[PDB]
Amino acid sequence: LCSLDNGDCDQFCHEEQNSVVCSCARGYTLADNGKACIPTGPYPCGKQTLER
């Protein structure tokens, strides 16, 4: 469930229609496995600008 380990989502977790649906901030897409979030451009939100 969410609580457990926050779904195992990288960011937001929700429970809806008996499933755990994770989401991401603006600037990220939910990834294939349904847990990770992928940046969309070079500078996401909440990521140190490490390198360049």
Add this chain to the structure above:
Amino acid sequence: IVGGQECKDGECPWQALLINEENEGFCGGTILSEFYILTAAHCLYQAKRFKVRVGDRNTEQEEGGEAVHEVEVVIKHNRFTKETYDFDIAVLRLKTPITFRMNVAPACLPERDWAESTLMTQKTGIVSGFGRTHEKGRQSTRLKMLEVPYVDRNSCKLSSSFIITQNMFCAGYDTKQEDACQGDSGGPHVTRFKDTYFVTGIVSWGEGCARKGKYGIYTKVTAFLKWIDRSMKTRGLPKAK
């Protein structure tokens, strides 16, 4: 900031500084997008003309990056009471967008509920700023960071001499002398969840910087989330909710 450390390049990229008529900074802000900055409504009253500067880590130097933007429209919460610093939030809309780049990135806005259950129940948050540094950190214009644990409302309400409404939340150490000080107001209070940072507060006030028994109080961004959101869609003056 009293006794924290400095920000390494890349480390605190959603930090904005507000400068006044004599290019002296007075408050700080958090970058939310290429057009908006969040700061503490009271800051509107510490200078008569101000601009926002980003990509800077040493107030008396230019390293590169360092951009200055002008404001176009600013939303201040219309329920801001100068006497309580309640509803202490304002969002600025700039005139020219920010070119995010090394040392200039936004902070993420969490989504209310999730924020409540995960970030706000974390053990600590981190705050940053360029103001008053009373400790052992050579130079006085560097950008600092300090990790403050969250305090529980009872112990907050029972320490502060003034009210704590549900839009304020307290953070800091009780005896250790590390804290948000004058010149960090407006600045960001961000919580890290799995290597991503979301903003949980805006530095609001304190009863002295690192006074034993007092903590610093921040605005409850989670209680302004939808407000912020609408504010980022409009281009008006105060508005509420």
